Chains A and B, each alone.
With several copies, the nearest count.
Chain A
Amino acid sequence: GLPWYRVHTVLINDPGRLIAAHLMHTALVAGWAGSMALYELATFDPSDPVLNPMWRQGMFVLPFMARLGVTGSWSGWSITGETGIDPGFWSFEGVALAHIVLSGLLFLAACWHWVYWDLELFRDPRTGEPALDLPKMFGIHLFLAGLLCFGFGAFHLTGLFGPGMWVSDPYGLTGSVQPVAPEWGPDGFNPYNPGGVVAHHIAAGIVGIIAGLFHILVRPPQRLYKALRMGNIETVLSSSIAAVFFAAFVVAGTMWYGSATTPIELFGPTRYQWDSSYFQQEINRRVQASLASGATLEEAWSAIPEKLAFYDYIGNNPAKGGLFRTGPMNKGDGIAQAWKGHAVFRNKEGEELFVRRMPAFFESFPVILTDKNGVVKADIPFRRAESKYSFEQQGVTVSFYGGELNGQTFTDPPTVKSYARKAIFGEIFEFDTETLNSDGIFRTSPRGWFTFAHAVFALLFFFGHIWHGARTLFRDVFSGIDPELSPEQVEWGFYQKVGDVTTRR
């Protein structure tokens, strides 16, 4: 009978049961979304959006509800910290319940369409055979996609009739859902301009409405119809897969690099913010300004928001994880409790020293301190017998400004060393390692896991495009080549054009 890898081909000439199979898949996907959200709701801790945001907690679908405006729970908390809010039906719980109900209704529709497969709508009036007019279906479905895309941009994103979308400042400190006006200028194409997302959907939606109308009304030319086997539904599978892996590579890209649609308060920082010391420069800028206004070192560093220091820490860098280090980031370094303050290192000569930071490539990294000029002035040596730069020799001390340790100074070498070992990770934080039995090993964030899964799925779907693209164009020889194939066709010299039997001699 059929090989195990071909069981689903019985749907190829059965549009009714193909719809049933497609309904069942949709019911399965919507059920997953509902289930996933309920599981995240049962485990999410909303009590600290500063040091314990969703992306430290392994939340995966929670940020996608929050991105488009679902921000609060029926139990009265919102992910922006406000207590005593009333979100109405469209809470996290309401969204989940809505997907569960949707799943069960699609399940019943699937049953009906599987039993009543022999609908006259699916049979060609001329020939009585099952037939689908795929050029016209594409026109209908394209028209609908355009309407939905326009409507989503014109109403939901603008706030004309809808909540808007997540927007934030450049350092992810003050995000919230806000209506967004379209940016129609050249900056609309800047992936970091959220106005471009609105304009895109308005414009593209209209183009889709128009193209949809064209494809409902104008038949494909005979040349293109034959070239692309438009009477064979597998040609659609082949091009649909191609479009889908194209989309998958794009979302993997924008998740890894960042854009207005992948904000850092929902998915965590990018690795490039660590590479360019993006948060550290902004922190330094604010410290400089306060010292200008005649603030003390203690006052200037105390003015730094804990949320901003927390971004300047390599444990939030998504390129620090491992493929089999599972779970939330809190399972690794622990649940962050407080900023300890900014550590300043000085040698016996009073000169300020700076710990060289760990680059994301390195699982481990030595502890090296340089001066403003980059001259090495202290380190923790491996071989002790000929060391010149040890902390004991150089009289290294550490003082904290801001945070919990504000105004403290440690001079004993063991303590100064353990703080220097943390400063290679950036700002130093207090962590609760007990609650989750954390093991001390960095994990990646949802941005990392999203990017990995979608880059991998995209690559596999390329193979699916190639496979179904070949079965479309080579359907005539799928079961083998012609048993009476002539050597004249395949040997050289007989035909002036390869394959064309009319070009003899």
Chain B
Amino acid sequence: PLGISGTFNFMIVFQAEHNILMHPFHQLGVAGVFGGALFCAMHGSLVTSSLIRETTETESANYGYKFGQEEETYNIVAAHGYFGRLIFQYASFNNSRSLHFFLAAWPVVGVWFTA
């Protein structure tokens, strides 16, 4: 149904007739969206954790980035150095393209399986 409570009714009746919780594609969908939210926070916090000092403390740090600037505003080597030590060195990305491809792939593939 096209409604808030209607969605819930759909979900409950679905569990009754298909045991969707015990279905591995839905379990993969939960890994997809939990994982996506995790990695969303990880990536947000790691880039934020390594912003380069560009402002004083009475201004938003957001003003340290200017739309269209050539240089990056964060130190990915520092972020890797932090995150590699948090886990171990090779559990961490140093390639931005590999990292962002991972960010795209995990929730997309997860939600394909749940669909």
Q: What's the minimum C-beta distance from A92 to chain B, rounded to whole angstroms?
A: 45
Mask, B49-86, CB within 8 Å of A = 1, is: 01111111111110010000000000101101110110
A490 touches B78 (CB 8 A): yes
- Chain B residues 30 to 44 lying within 8 A of chain A, measured CB to CB, are none
Task: Answer whether residue B89 sits at the interface, using C-beta atoms and an 8 A cutoff.
Answer: yes
A480 touches B58 (CB 8 A): no
A6 touches B81 (CB 8 A): no
Q: What's the minimum C-beta distance from B71 to chain A, rounded to whole angstroms?
A: 10
Mask, A487-499, CB within 8 Å of B = 1, is: 1011110000010
Given contacts A479-B56, A479-B61, A481-B75, contact A491 B51 (CB under 8 A): no
By a CB distance below 8 angstroms, the chain A residues around B54 are 479-480, 483
Task: Answer whether residue A119 sits at the interface, using C-beta atoms and an 8 A cutoff.
Answer: no
A480 touches B85 (CB 8 A): no
A2 touches B58 (CB 8 A): yes
**Which among A481, A487, A492, A498 has the greatest number of chain B C-beta atoms within 10 A?**
A481
Closest chain A residue, CB of each to CB of B51: A480
Given contacts A3-B60, A6-B58, A479-B61, contact A492 B53 (CB under 8 A): no
A498 touches B85 (CB 8 A): yes
Mask, A265-302, CB within 8 Å of B = 1, is: 00000000000000000000000000000000000000
A481 touches B50 (CB 8 A): yes
By a CB distance below 8 angstroms, the chain B residues around A491 are 77, 81
Given contacts A487-B77, A492-B84, contact A481 B58 (CB under 8 A): no
| B interface residue count range (under 10 / 10 to 19 / 20 to 34 / 35 or more) | 20 to 34
Closest chain A residue, CB of each to CB of B55: A479
By a CB distance below 8 angstroms, the chain A residues around B59 are 1-3
Task: Answer whether residue A375 sits at the interface, using C-beta atoms and an 8 A cutoff.
Answer: no
Q: What's the minimum C-beta distance from B57 to chain A, rounded to whole angstroms?
A: 5
Q: Which of A478, A480, A489 contacts B64 (CB 8 A)?
A: A480
By a CB distance below 8 angstroms, the chain A residues around B57 are 478-479
B64 touches A490 (CB 8 A): no
Task: Answer whether residue A323 sits at the interface, using C-beta atoms and an 8 A cutoff.
Answer: no
B85 touches A483 (CB 8 A): no
Mask, A450-492, CB within 8 Å of B = 1, is: 0000000000000000000000000001111111010101111
B81 touches A481 (CB 8 A): no
A483 touches B58 (CB 8 A): no
Closest chain A residue, CB of each to CB of B64: A480
Given contacts A485-B75, A490-B81, contact A477 B58 (CB under 8 A): no
By a CB distance below 8 angstroms, the chain A residues around B81 are 489-492
- Chain A residues 1 to 20 lying within 8 A of chain B, measured CB to CB, are 1-3, 6, 9
A481 touches B52 (CB 8 A): yes
B53 touches A490 (CB 8 A): no
Q: Which of B51, B55, B56, B77 contacts A490 (CB 8 A)?
A: B77
Given contacts A490-B77, A491-B77, contact A480 B84 (CB under 8 A): no
B60 touches A485 (CB 8 A): no
Q: Which of A1, A481, A498 contacts B78 (CB 8 A)?
A: A481
Q: What's the minimum C-beta distance from B51 to chain A, rounded to whole angstroms?
A: 5
By a CB distance below 8 angstroms, the chain B residues around A6 are 58
By a CB distance below 8 angstroms, the chain A residues around B78 are 481, 485, 490
By a CB distance below 8 angstroms, the chain B residues around A479 are 53-57, 61
Q: What's the minimum C-beta distance from B61 to chain A, rounded to whole angstroms?
A: 6
Q: Which of B53, B64, B77 contacts A477 (CB 8 A)?
A: B53
A490 touches B58 (CB 8 A): no
Closest chain A residue, CB of each to CB of B50: A481
A480 touches B52 (CB 8 A): yes
By a CB distance below 8 angstroms, the chain B residues around A482 are 53
B77 touches A480 (CB 8 A): no
By a CB distance below 8 angstroms, the chain A residues around B61 are 479-480
Q: What's the minimum C-beta distance from B83 to chain A, rounded to whole angstroms?
A: 10
By a CB distance below 8 angstroms, the chain B residues around A487 are 77
Q: Which of A9, A483, A489, A490 contacts B52 (CB 8 A)?
A: A483
Given contacts A3-B60, A6-B58, contact A483 B53 (CB under 8 A): yes
- Chain B residues 75 to 109 lying within 8 A of chain A, measured CB to CB, are 75, 77-78, 80-82, 84-85, 89
Q: What's the minimum C-beta distance from B64 to chain A, rounded to whole angstroms?
A: 7
By a CB distance below 8 angstroms, the chain B residues around A1 are 58-59
A-B contact pairs, 26 of them (CB 8 A): A2-B58, A3-B59, A6-B58, A9-B58, A477-B53, A479-B54, A479-B56, A479-B57, A480-B53, A480-B61, A480-B64, A481-B51, A481-B52, A481-B53, A482-B53, A483-B52, A485-B75, A485-B78, A487-B77, A490-B78, A490-B81, A490-B82, A491-B77, A491-B81, A492-B89, A498-B85
Q: Which residues of A contact B (CB under 8 A)?
A: 1-3, 6, 9, 477-483, 485, 487, 489-492, 498
Q: Which residues of B contact A (CB under 8 A)?
A: 50-61, 64, 75, 77-78, 80-82, 84-85, 89
Ranked 8 nearest A-B pairs via Cβ = A490-B81, A480-B53, A480-B51, A3-B60, A483-B52, A490-B78, A479-B57, A479-B53
